[PDB]
Structure formats: structure tokens, C-alpha cells
Swiss-Prot record, chains A, B, C:
Signal peptide: none annotated. It comes from Homo sapiens. The record marks S76, E79 as: Important for binding TNFRSF6B. Glycans are attached at N37, N118. The gene is TNFSF15. It is found in: Secreted. Residues 1-140 are extracellular. The chain holds residues 90 to 251 of 251 of the full protein. Residues 6-140 form the THD domain. It comes from the Eukaryota. This is Tumor necrosis factor ligand superfamily member 15, secreted form.
Length: 140, 140, 140
């Protein structure tokens, strides 16, 4: 049993005032471990390597589309860099609707890189349960 | 080459009589290995650690929504615990429709924990091909 | 820090003339490493083992459905084998629409196996940004 590898699973909460979400990180099912830092809406990478990244956001209801982006930031570039984008057009039947949107992929990251999630529209996101909207990464 | 880590990929089959699905586990592409147990519709975790979990269910067609939950059960709690929920409202164009719904995330699990998948409606699930509905986990 | 494990993240580009997509593999965020080969629209597995596989394709707009398949080919079988299928029916509101479709699961593969992605309709795929359509795998 080795690792000790950095790992984090974060879950949704009521957002206060493309916007980034902020996160639960220790309560319920969320957690961070092995030097992973969740701070200031970011995941802070402690070790350069290849990570698998994910998030699902569930959206629920007059807009055109919903969109998620998981986004990397480094002080090397400080142009921020877009790793994953889920974008879906919306079908105006209700209109009490909801759609999950889910991403995950692998990326090579520098120690010190920053990760956040951004949505088209913070007021659409379902913040109510921890298993509907979340965001996670681990070192491979 | 180490691991020997527990790993399982399960695939869909015709369900007999929120309901849990049951699974193929050795035929075709499914499998379990390294002490993973598939029994009684559960995945039985043999080693406490962090696992990545997934399932896609494809649904196909007068209902409101479809929903998947991947769900953990322990004899510690025996309140069952909801790890992942995909829920989507349905668009009544056809109505011969179908939608895949896909989840996966990482979780810290006790050896002895139980995992199952639950759907809003067993009669909606496409059981026909193994690559449309499935469910899987591995130790990280 | 061990591995040295085979790993690849590939991203979308303008397709030239079920069709397989072809891929970016070194520029931007794509890459292959540790003996992984991307050639002739395939991912060529260099080591038998269990791999986690994924792809999202985003589709954008008079058709019935969209579909992705990730597909394995070996010279053992040369019947090609379907590992993952995302299929979704389409809702003809616009009709400037778009839908992401995302798969990933674990599979046991022979060294020498070949992997490709196939879609229902190459002209529907959004090729414009690298974070909308992609395809990836790593050795577990
Ligand atoms: Cl959808």
C-alpha cells in the first residue's frame, strides 16, 4: 500500500456572491489529503505529475445554454488555461428543468498550478445535495 | 508491474423483478479481480482505500425525470449513503427517446463497504448492449 | 515517484474526409508518453494491463440521434469490439443546438490492441476548441 499521492474530492454548497464556484472540502464526503490544498476556490497542486480531473455540475431552472469549465491557472502564464469544457444548449420544457454536466480527463500539471471550476451561471447550479455537484482530482 | 489492486467492471443485463440494478460480471467485457466481490447486486470492497467509481446508465422510452444513484452501504451506518447522483429531466419528443447518464468520482471506502446502483425506473433502462449501461470501480 | 506507465490525452481538430475521428497528440494540451502510440487514428497499447479510457465528444447542429463509440481492435479478433457507447436522441429546438457526450471506463487490454473513437456523424462534431472534444487513456 503506497500513496500518499495527492487527492481531493470536493462537493457543492450554497454559493455566495465566468464565475468560479466555491466548495465544501472536509465535511460529509469531501476531503483533501496528501498536501492538496483547497483554498480561495482553488485546488492547489502540490506535486508536478499527471492528474485525472473531474467535475459534475448539476444545473436546474429562459437561458440559451449551460457550460462548465475546469480551468488551470499558473503564475508562469497568468493567462488562465481551459482544460475541460462541458457546454449544452437548453430545452425550454417546464420550465422547471435540470441537467447534469460531467467532465473528467487526465492532465500534466506543475506543482503550484491552480484549478478551479467555472460555470455559465451561478444561480442555475443545484447546491442542495453533495452528490449532484462536485469536483475532484488525483495524482496518477 | 504492481497491483493486484481490486478492480471491477460490470455490465448490464435483462433485469428481473429506488430499485437497484443487477449485473453481468464475468461474461463479455465484465470482470472482477483481486478480491472484489460482486454479489447480491453489490460490489463488495475488500480493502479500505480510495476508489474511483463509475457508472453510465443509458435510459430509453410520459415520465418526469430519470435519475441514477451510486450508493454505499455499510453495517456501521446501515443508513445507506448516496455518493453520486445523476438526475435529468426528460423531453417528450417521440416519444421513442434515449439518454445516457454518466457518473464517476473518487471515494474513501472501508473494506466491507457495499456498492450498488439505483435508478429512478428499472423499466427504462437499456439492457441490450454491454457498452451502454455499466458500472465500475478501482482502487486508486 | 514510479510510472513510466503509458498515458495519453488526445484532443480534437478539423476532420478531413461509423467513421473514426482523428486527433491532435502533441500540440496544446495533448500528449502521448511511455510508449503509447497514436497513429492512423489509433491508440496503440504498448503493454497488456488494465486501462481507464475516456472520451467526450461535443456535438453541435434534422438528425435522429448522436452516438459515440470507443472501440477496440486486435489482430487476434479482427472483428472490432465495442467498449463504450454513448447514444443520445436529439431535440430539434433551434436548430443551432449542441450536446456533449462523455464516456470513460476501465478495460483489460492486450499489448498491441488498438483504440479508436467513432461517431454517428463526423460533420456534427465540434472541432474548434481542444477542451470540448477529446479522448484519453491510461494504464492503471
Ligand atoms: Cl442531455
Amino acid at each position: 500500500a503506497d500513496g500518499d499521492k495527492p487527492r481531493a474530492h470536493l462537493t457543492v454548497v450554497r454559493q455566495t456572491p465566468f464565475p468560479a464556484l466555491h466548495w465544501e472540502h472536509e465535511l460529509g464526503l469531501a476531503f483533501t489529503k496528501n498536501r492538496m490544498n483547497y483554498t480561495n476556490k482553488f485546488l492547489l497542486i502540490p506535486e508536478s505529475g499527471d492528474y485525472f480531473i473531474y467535475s459534475q455540475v448539476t444545473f436546474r431552472g429562459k437561458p440559451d445554454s449551460i457550460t462548465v469549465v475546469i480551468t488551470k491557472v499558473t503564475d508562469s502564464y497568468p493567462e488562465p488555461t481551459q482544460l475541460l469544457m462541458g457546454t449544452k444548449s437548453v430545452c425550454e420544457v417546464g420550465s422547471n428543468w435540470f441537467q447534469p454536466i460531467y467532465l473528467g480527463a487526465m492532465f500534466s500539471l506543475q506543482e503550484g498550478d491552480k484549478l478551479m471550476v467555472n460555470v455559465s451561471d451561478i444561480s442555475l447550479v443545484d447546491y442542495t445535495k453533495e452528490d449532484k455537484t462536485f469536483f475532484g482530482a488525483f495524482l496518477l
